[PDB]
A paper describes a structure:
Our model protein for comparing methods of RT structure determination is the coelomic hemoglobin from the marine annelid [name]. Named dehaloperoxidase, this O2-transport protein is capable of oxidizing a wide array of substrates by either electron or O-atom transfer. DHP exhibits four activities common to heme proteins, peroxidase, peroxy­gen­ase, oxidase and oxygenase, with each activity employing an Fe(IV)-oxo (ferryl) intermediate. In this study, structures of a multifunctional globin, [name] (DHP-B), obtained using several methods of room-temperature crystallographic structure determination are described and compared.
As well as this, we present an X-ray crystal structure that was determined from the same crystal as previously used for collection of the neutron data (data set NX-Xray). Following the completion of neutron data collection, RT X-ray diffraction data were collected from the same crystal using an in-house source (NX-Xray). The Fe distance to O-MPEG in the NX-Xray structure is 2.23 Å, which is much shorter than in the NX structure (3.04 Å). During RT data collection, we assume that the ferric heme centre of protomer A was rapidly photoreduced to the ferrous state due to the ionizing properties of the X-ray beam, which is consistent with extensive studies on heme proteins and specifically of DHP. This reduction could lead to displacement of the MPEG molecule as DHP forms the oxyferrous state. The SSX, SLX and NX-Xray structures incurred X-ray doses ranging from 21.8 to 83 kGy.
Numbering used by the authors:
A (entry chain B), B (entry chain A): 1 to 137
Write the structure that this text describes.
């Protein structure tokens, strides 16, 4: 289930983080514009870029902690507040996070591994809800 | 405390894993003989190899899972058994693990962060005991 999935992703986190974030950027090409120097690059070029590798690893390290601290796929309010107050996320909305979780769930369903994709769908919706209550537009 | 330390380390797992492993190898150069692929290389050469980062991240992820499952810094006997039965740990003794934790605690005390270095010292001692009880020489 959900708890074992966190363990599965952590076991190969660098690979999963890059694969899932690329799936997001390719499913929603407009989301590349939030990032500098991502446009015009294929996936293998992105994986060679320092800031891509560093950001995606930090995204997923923290996301797995938020998932780990949730109860029944509902995140702690404090984790939602933490994500809203990050200075780097100045011009983000919940829609950016919504789209990331649609791509993540789609990646899990296509993967052939036994992820609990329904729980991740719930987790993504509940995190978006928490982000809005914490102050994200 | 200890539980926050796990969250700090997991937040930047690949970076901490490499720096701590290098601190171990450089404090105890005899231990590098166990890692034939890493002999003859400086710190920056090792950090530039993908296989070094990949290995240290996987190892450190498992160490954090063991630490997370411990009670009062006492690891589960089942986790100690997993570590003893791993094929890559054939020929290791509890002395190798003791040296790892001396270097870990030294690294935490020098880092200038608010790690609970005393709890990690206790966890290392209790892990060494559990490894003996699970069959390690
Ligand atoms: C979901 C969990 C996320 C976490 C934990 C997270 C975390 C971080 C962190 C630690 C940084 C470091 C600042 C830096 O050096 O760039 C950062 C920057 C950044 N993040 Fe995120 N982020 C998340 C989601 C997103 C999403 C969905 C977007 C969508 C656009 C995004 C866009 C950015 C951007 C644009 C930067 C600044 C780098 C740049 O200007 O290209 N993040 N984020
Ligand atoms: C709590 C402490 C430790 C944990 C959780 C741990 C875990 C692991 C894991 C998961 C692997 C396989 C990694 C991979 O697939 O690349 C591994 C390999 C290995 N470990 Fe450990 N280990 C620990 C302590 C040690 C110590 C103290 C030593 C020696 C001083 C050691 C020596 C080795 C060696 C030689 C390998 C083979 C690496 C290779 O050939 O690629 N381990 N360990």
């Amino acid at each position: 289930g959900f708890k074992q999935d966190i363990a599965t992703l952590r076991g190969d986190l660098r690979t999963y983080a890059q694969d899932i974030f690329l799936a997001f950027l390719n499913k929603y090409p407009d989301e590349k514009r939030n990032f500098k120097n991502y446009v015009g690059k294929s996936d293998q070029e992105l994986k060679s870029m320092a800031k891509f590798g560093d950001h995606t690893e930090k995204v997923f390290n923290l996301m797995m902690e938020v998932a780990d601290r949730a109860t029944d796929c509902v995140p702690l309010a404090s984790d939602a507040s933490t994500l809203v107050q990050m200075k780097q996320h100045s011009g983000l909305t919940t829609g950016n996070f919504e789209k990331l979780f649609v791509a993540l769930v789609e990646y899990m369903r296509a993967s052939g591994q036994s992820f609990d994709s329904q729980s991740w769908d719930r987790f993504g919706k509940n995190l978006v809800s928490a982000l809005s209550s914490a102050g994200m537009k």
